Amino acid sequence: VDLTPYILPGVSFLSDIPQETLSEIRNQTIRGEAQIRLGELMVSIRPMQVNGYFMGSLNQDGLSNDNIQIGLQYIEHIERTLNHGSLTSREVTVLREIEMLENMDLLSNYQLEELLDKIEVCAFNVEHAQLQVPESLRTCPVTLCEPEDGVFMRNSMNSNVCMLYDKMALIHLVKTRAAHPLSRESIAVSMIVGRDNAAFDPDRGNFVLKN
């Protein structure tokens, strides 16, 4: 497809293109990619990850700054003319990035320092703690090893049962905003507990919170 016909001098937009021509651009992209000619410059339109939006690239090599910028402007125009809401692909990406934020992704920033501080406070030297329990409760569910510095974490928001994790692993889970490996809930301060707040219960076969 060529759009040189619709070019205009001294400005960064093209003339009123007829819809059927744009539909053919959308078809050529929907196949794979659409190669548009402007002046005698190549631009490649590919369909974006979101349905109905299109993204342009400039197949260029060693061209003049003027040509680069003008080309980019024409891509912006083509993108706006093709896309829903007259958006550029960049704007589309920003909006989609906003959409793709998840529960607690923004509110974790405020809770983080408190949470890390609580981990830091609650962490203990495992071998000094002289835990009389079976090997399985000595090993972290993330590292699959006995940690040197260990931290007790509850199985869920309201669980009376906690497990021993590697401090570094807990720090990694919190810093990556990862879900609790069992409950899949967001990890929160109240889940973290100090060595003296939990005891091994032989009949339940688990560390239980103190009464």
Place this chain on the structure above:
Amino acid sequence: VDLTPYILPGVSFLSDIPQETLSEIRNQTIRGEAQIRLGELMVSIRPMQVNGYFMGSLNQDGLSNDNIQIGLQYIEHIERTLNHGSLTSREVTVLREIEMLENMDLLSNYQLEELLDKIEVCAFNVEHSLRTCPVTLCEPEDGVFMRNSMNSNVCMLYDKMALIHLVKTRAAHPLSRESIAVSMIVGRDNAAFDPDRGNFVLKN
């Protein structure tokens, strides 16, 4: 539980409260709600939908502007003092509203306009049991045919305004609970009453 002791004159903040008192506030909210006394004014602290954040309301009726604003300032302070990041509940709600956006929530504005346009095209009327709309429970003046689901073949007559209301509020299909989509909307000539089935069926 009272914070008047920690009040300060001519300003919107309280004195350095001792943590054990705040813990008791957190307990009283964690139960249900905590009733705080400030001056001789009631404020109710509830835990927000997000864990770790707290929201204050002023149980008031016909009180002085001064009292309203001062009360609200004290709620702002209490909220900031209690909440993570020193945020107000409002700010929390804004952040959470940002988080709660879903795929296509910003980018789908054209599907509303397309849907409304299709309703507009498909609606039929006078104006230059199967008669009554399942939403309005009335016979509409301007009616529109909508399919019971994505692949139903059976449609019902709705009030145009009701369909506009469903689409504008992004509401689920009242029967199938699917998202309402253009293909579900059909024009008068695409459906016929079938006596044996007792329903409007799509054309063959």
